[PDB]
């Protein structure tokens, strides 16, 4: 077999990106300032963190084993619990004490035959008394919210119709449904999309098989009262390329950004309309809703070139690091329209942004608040001279949060400081009575001065000021998505506004 | 109650001394070089690490909750397990989420009445299939060697005759006895010493009550074939001082360093002879043995002033930090002699030293190898300009290990580097056939450059060279004592040479 390295090497595992790989507890975290005592619940986030050095040199960030952090809040006290998802990959590599899984989504490079290749490292969501650790190439892994024990690969009582479950399911605050899909739903390189939903009782509701015009990456999707929307990233899969040791994904400059629209209830595969947006990168969906006219307003991050530059086109053509900006775009779609080409989107702010969150109490309905990460290159905001040589690479950079009031157009910006970067934020309703977007925002900071992580607690009344700064004595590697589970919500999801 | 701080403050918890307070696992530690594949067993060490900020400002290092590290070695792979001892202090403070125990060994400063005040933070030893977490003011706490679960306060099947159990019991390699004592054996300020031993079957053998000439700290002791030896540190306890909120310990310039000698078997309390060594600090015992004439050779660290300078005399007189050196002394004692005053000791090396270890296969018999920590002020050996502002305070400093061959007089020195300091080393016999002092030495390093801990593995054939450097991604706070439990030893202790 290819030799297993006994320590981490390369930029992807240097400085702040160096794996820690700790599992266990740190109770009674140090706090500067004061955590509002009314906050009760858990902040769950996932980070890719390779448990063993890869036999593949400079293995990307996003191929790392899913490690779950829980920050448990009560009466102004907070405890950390940390545990790896027991994926087939994790268990078999732990048993062998060496890496066995190969390149991102390429089973032809694996040193052994895996049934499930999930790193479960993209998102961690609450559903019917379990956590679901998500990776879009795989079913979810079910975990205990209290202990972070892994129950195992989850198939919804044998109801799961798809080989794949999206990292970005949507929770309808009115119907209490989990709205899901998977792409490559019948295996590597398949154009099959399976759209499916589960009622609050755990019974499967919708199951509609449709066909993608290309085998493109559908990372995120959008749900409205009457429609589900599938934005396709112009990254395309060729199984024959994979069989020769090539990348699962390759950029295609020659195709539009397809946006499929399907009736949410009772539809057939053929009812989908593949609208064609100007060529570009489909980033994370903030939210979608139908306006008075019944037109879909799709608000999402959108870039004009390949954000995933490490997967260029067939001729190796693509952007260089930190060159591509994503902007907060609004697309208008009419399911009635027979005109497939879509107009250029309007932009809601100027900022280079990603990781948009809304008050999920209005998810699938009209929202007037969005919180999102920003990357401001204006000199001084980030001390790049100090940070870059300590940062490593392979992970997206964010040097602030922004709150947009969609009505007033007002923007508040949180700037943690010149030697700190942020992850994805969560929003917490102040209480079950609070107005949309009124309450607390939490965000994990990387402090390159201390080489330590911090959890910032912000009040939405003044996003510029830290109410509390929770000082972790370890590093938490830059992570992906996270979610709030409020103690006052019995099913883990907030009540409709 | 006095307010509980919500973050650590003061020099005792700054830089490398900042508590991490993590419990759990880090498997498959990163290795530079190669761990000899024949090494099989566990390195256990204990560190004081306050779980909650003290209500007492600048609480000393040595009042911190005992946290146990296990480094589990097999086939050139190593795993870390880390867990706090579940002392009464730990459990009740965890429940209250605030510090409750007060000043070092002063129950009159506690915010609640404790039955047991142990932090179990001084030593961790193997006895009959359990770990014993030791603190000289308390009985041991029993723990699972595999999981580091705390069983609870241990009384040897109700046989423990003393309120107190020394942090420095001795294991007789021939008789397989654990030889023990406790001072202040009948409570605060008592001059009662209880000498007791346990056979390999767990049955108590010796139990002899004797009286100390003063209520002095007896931190360490020595065992020979026929004698047990009690060196008294001129730190003296006054219960009346404690009742007013004063220190348990206060230096007395007016007394000698008493060295009690008692027949090991069948003695009465009155059989003890209190020999009087020149005034000084009794450091850790390397080993003691009877020579051809039946005279006790006691080899131990010995200083001419108060090493514990934070506990000065009644008028606040004592040394300043880093002023007092301890030297590797040999004292000669004859139990037959009626001459109580002892000659000045001969010195085996020039180095400022402490934490002596021998090949414990010759413990209580003649030894010709000693490994010990050194603090060398020779310019360049430690980059004090870089280290000191990152180091914090309250913990002893060591910038190398030395191996002394007592026959040849040869000294090998391990120097980890200018920006690294060491803890206490362990010695591992190469195999059950190896000569005295032949095998491996392990020592935990603080790397002030990375602000990370490392575990160095050395071969006794060349102590200057690291065979392996195990890179921990976290800090382990400067600790106290540790012990090797070899897999090949059924009762956890090596076979007589
Ligand atoms: Cl598990
Ligand atoms: Cl326990
Ligand atoms: Fe995502
Ligand atoms: Fe000691």
């Amino acid at each position: 077999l290819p030799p297993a390295p006994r320590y981490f090497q390369g930029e992807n595992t240097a400085g702040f990106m160096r794996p820690v790989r700790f599992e266990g507890d740190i109770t009674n975290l140090e706090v500067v300032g004061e955590i509002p005592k009314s906050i009760e619940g858990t902040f769950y986030r996932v980070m890719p963190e390779p448990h063993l050095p890869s036999f593949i040199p400079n293995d990307p960030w996003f191929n790392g084993d899913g490690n779950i952090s829980g920050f448990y809040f009560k009466d102004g006290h907070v405890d950390l619990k940390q545990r790896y998802v027991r994926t087939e990959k994790f268990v078999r590599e732990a048993e062998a004490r060496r890496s066995l899984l190969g390149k991102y989504r390429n089973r032809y490079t694996d040193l052994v035959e895996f049934k499930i290749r999930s790193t479960a490292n993209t998102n961690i969501v609450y559903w019917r008394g379990q956590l679901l650790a998500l990776k879009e190439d795989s079913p979810p892994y079910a975990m205990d919210p209290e202990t972070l024990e892994t129950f195992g690969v989850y198939d919804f009582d044998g109801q799961l119709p798809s080989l794949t479950f999206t990292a970005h399911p949507k929770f309808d605050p009115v119907t209490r449904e989990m709205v899901c899909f998977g792409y490559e739903a019948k295996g590597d390189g398949t154009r099959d999309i399976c759209y499916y939903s589960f009622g609050p009782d755990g019974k499967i509701a919708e199951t509609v098989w449709l066909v993608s015009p290309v085998c493109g990456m559908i990372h995120d999707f959008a749900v409205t009262e009457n429609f589900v929307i599938f934005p396709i990233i112009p990254l395309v899969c060729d199984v024959e390329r994979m069989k020769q040791g090539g990348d699962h994904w390759q950029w295609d400059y020659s195709i539009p950004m397809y946006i499929g629209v399907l009736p949410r209830r009772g539809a057939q595969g053929s009812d989908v309309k593949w609208f064609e947006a100007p060529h570009g990168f489909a980033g994370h969906v903030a939210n979608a809703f139908e306006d008075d006219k019944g037109h879909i307003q799709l608000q999402m991050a959108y870039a004009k070139d390949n954000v995933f530059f490490w997967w260029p086109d067939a001729n190796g053509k693509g952007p260089r690091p930190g060159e591509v900006e994503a902007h907060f775009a609004n697309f208008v779609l009419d399911y009635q329209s027979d005109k497939l080409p879509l107009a250029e989107p309007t932009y809601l702010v100027d900022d280079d942004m990603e990781f948009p969150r809304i008050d999920d109490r209005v998810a699938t309905r009209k929202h007037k608040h969005t919180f999102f990460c920003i990357f401001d290159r204006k000199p001084g905001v980030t001390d790049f001279e100090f940070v870059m040589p300590r940062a490593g690479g392979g992970a997206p950079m964010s040097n602030g949060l922004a709150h947009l009031n969609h009505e007033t157009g007002d923007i508040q910006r949180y700037l943690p400081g010149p030697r700190k970067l942020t992850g994805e934020c969560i929003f917490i309703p102040r209480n079950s009575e609070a107005a949309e977007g009124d309450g607390y925002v939490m965000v994990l900071l990387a402090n390159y001065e201390d080489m330590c992580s911090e959890l910032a607690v912000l009040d939405t009344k003044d996003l510029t000021n830290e109410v509390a700064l929770i000082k972790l004595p370890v590093r938490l590697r830059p992570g992906v998505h996270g979610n709030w589970v409020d103690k006052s919500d019995v099913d883990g999801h907030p009540a409709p506004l």
Side-chain angles (χ1 to χ4, degrees), chain A residues 128-145:
Chain A
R128 293 187 63 251
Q130 299 184 122
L131 300 183
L132 300 179
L134 306 188
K135 177 79 168 200
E136 67 200 49
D137 73 351
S138 293
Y141 274 82
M143 309 177 76
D144 192 307

Side-chain angles (χ1 to χ4, degrees), chain A residues 155-280:
Chain A
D155 66 8
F156 298 83
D157 304 307
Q159 294 177 106
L160 182 64
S162 176
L163 291 194
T164 61
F165 185 104
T166 182
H168 291 290
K170 297 294 186 288
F171 301 92
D172 189 322
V174 172
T175 66
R176 315 308 293 181
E177 293 171 307
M178 191 169 59
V179 193
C180 318
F181 76 100
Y183 75 92
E184 294 187 54
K186 295 196 185 184
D188 290 339
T190 63
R191 292 190 292 120
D192 303 283
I193 297 164
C194 194
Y195 161 63
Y196 52 96
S197 63
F198 298 95
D201 58 348
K203 289 306 157 153
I204 196 156
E206 295 295 318
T207 294
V208 181
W209 291 91
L210 47 149
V211 170
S212 195
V214 299
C215 187
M217 174 187 289
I218 314 182
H219 179 65
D220 206 340
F221 88 137
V223 181
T224 68
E225 183 177 336
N226 299 293
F227 300 108
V228 296
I229 302 96
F230 306 97
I232 309 190
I233 303 167
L235 286 165
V236 179
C237 175
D238 182 357
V239 175
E240 294 307 316
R241 183 179 61 240
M242 283 163 56
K243 278 174 177 152
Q244 300 172 40
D247 295 339
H248 188 102
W249 294 122
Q250 182 178 92
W251 194 258
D252 190 339
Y253 280 106
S254 88
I255 62 172
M257 188 181 89
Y258 291 103
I259 305 181
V261 177
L262 186 74
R264 180 167 165 183
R265 303 181 192 281
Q268 289 187 332
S270 46
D271 294 329
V272 67
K273 291 199 191 177
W274 295 107
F275 295 96
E276 300 171 1
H279 174 87

Side-chain angles (χ1 to χ4, degrees), chain A residues 4 11 25 76-77 79 159 184 190 199 239-240 254 286 296 304 318 322 341 383 389 407 410 429 458:
Chain A
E11 201 198 14
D25 305 281
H77 297 284
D79 302 328
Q159 294 177 106
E184 294 187 54
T190 63
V239 175
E240 294 307 316
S254 88
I296 297 160
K304 281 309 202 181
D383 179 1
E407 288 198 348
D410 288 335
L458 313 178

Side-chain angles (χ1 to χ4, degrees), chain A residues 134-455:
Chain A
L134 306 188
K135 177 79 168 200
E136 67 200 49
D137 73 351
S138 293
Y141 274 82
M143 309 177 76
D144 192 307
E146 190 179 29
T147 70
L148 301 185
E149 181 202 344
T150 303
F151 297 127
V153 65
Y154 190 58
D155 66 8
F156 298 83
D157 304 307
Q159 294 177 106
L160 182 64
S162 176
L163 291 194
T164 61
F165 185 104
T166 182
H168 291 290
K170 297 294 186 288
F171 301 92
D172 189 322
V174 172
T175 66
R176 315 308 293 181
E177 293 171 307
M178 191 169 59
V179 193
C180 318
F181 76 100
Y183 75 92
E184 294 187 54
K186 295 196 185 184
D188 290 339
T190 63
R191 292 190 292 120
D192 303 283
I193 297 164
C194 194
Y195 161 63
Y196 52 96
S197 63
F198 298 95
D201 58 348
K203 289 306 157 153
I204 196 156
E206 295 295 318
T207 294
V208 181
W209 291 91
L210 47 149
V211 170
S212 195
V214 299
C215 187
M217 174 187 289
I218 314 182
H219 179 65
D220 206 340
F221 88 137
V223 181
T224 68
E225 183 177 336
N226 299 293
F227 300 108
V228 296
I229 302 96
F230 306 97
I232 309 190
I233 303 167
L235 286 165
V236 179
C237 175
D238 182 357
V239 175
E240 294 307 316
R241 183 179 61 240
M242 283 163 56
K243 278 174 177 152
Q244 300 172 40
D247 295 339
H248 188 102
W249 294 122
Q250 182 178 92
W251 194 258
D252 190 339
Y253 280 106
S254 88
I255 62 172
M257 188 181 89
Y258 291 103
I259 305 181
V261 177
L262 186 74
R264 180 167 165 183
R265 303 181 192 281
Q268 289 187 332
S270 46
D271 294 329
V272 67
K273 291 199 191 177
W274 295 107
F275 295 96
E276 300 171 1
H279 174 87
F281 194 97
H284 286 108
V285 174
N287 186 50
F289 63 91
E290 298 158 41
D291 62 17
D292 25 306
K293 313 141 201 201
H295 295 162
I296 297 160
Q297 308 293 314
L298 173 62
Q299 315 202 333
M300 64 185 298
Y302 176 68
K304 281 309 202 181
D305 213 339
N306 184 8
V307 171
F308 301 167
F309 57 83
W310 54 84
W311 296 319
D313 86 350
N315 304 320
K317 180 208 173 202
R320 272 152 308 103
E323 178 187 323
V324 183
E325 301 189 4
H327 302 292
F328 194 8
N330 187 100
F331 290 91
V332 190
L333 298 97
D334 189 344
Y335 179 71
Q336 308 323 319
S337 177
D338 291 315
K339 227 170 185 299
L340 292 192
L342 296 175
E344 286 280 344
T346 55
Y347 295 102
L348 302 177
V349 301
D350 304 341
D351 303 75
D352 181 19
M353 55 81 70
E354 247 293 352
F355 295 111
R357 306 307 295 275
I358 61 152
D359 187 330
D360 284 325
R361 292 182 290 167
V362 297
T364 76
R365 298 295 162 77
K366 178 153 146 70
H367 71 279
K368 67 163 177 191
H369 296 276
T370 307
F371 313 84
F372 52 86
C373 291
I374 60 172
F375 189 49
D376 198 339
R377 286 172 195 74
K378 175 180 75 203
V381 173
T382 301
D383 179 1
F384 290 115
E385 212 170 324
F386 184 86
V387 170
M388 283 317 95
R390 295 174 166 244
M397 293 204 172
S398 167
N399 57 10
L401 293 178
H403 176 209
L404 175 66
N405 191 328
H406 290 232
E407 288 198 348
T408 74
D410 288 335
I411 303 173
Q412 274 206 299
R413 289 182 176 76
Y414 170 59
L415 278 296
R419 298 181 167 183
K420 298 188 184 182
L421 301 176
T422 82
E424 181 196 60
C425 79
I426 54 155
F427 167 76
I428 305 162
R430 195 175 304 282
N431 50 66
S432 53
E433 213 67 11
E436 186 182 334
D438 179 52
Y440 311 100
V441 162
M442 293 191 189
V443 65
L444 201 69
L445 305 182
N447 186 342
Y448 294 90
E449 272 215 320
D450 294 350
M451 297 302 285
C452 283
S453 298
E454 303 162 347
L455 186 53

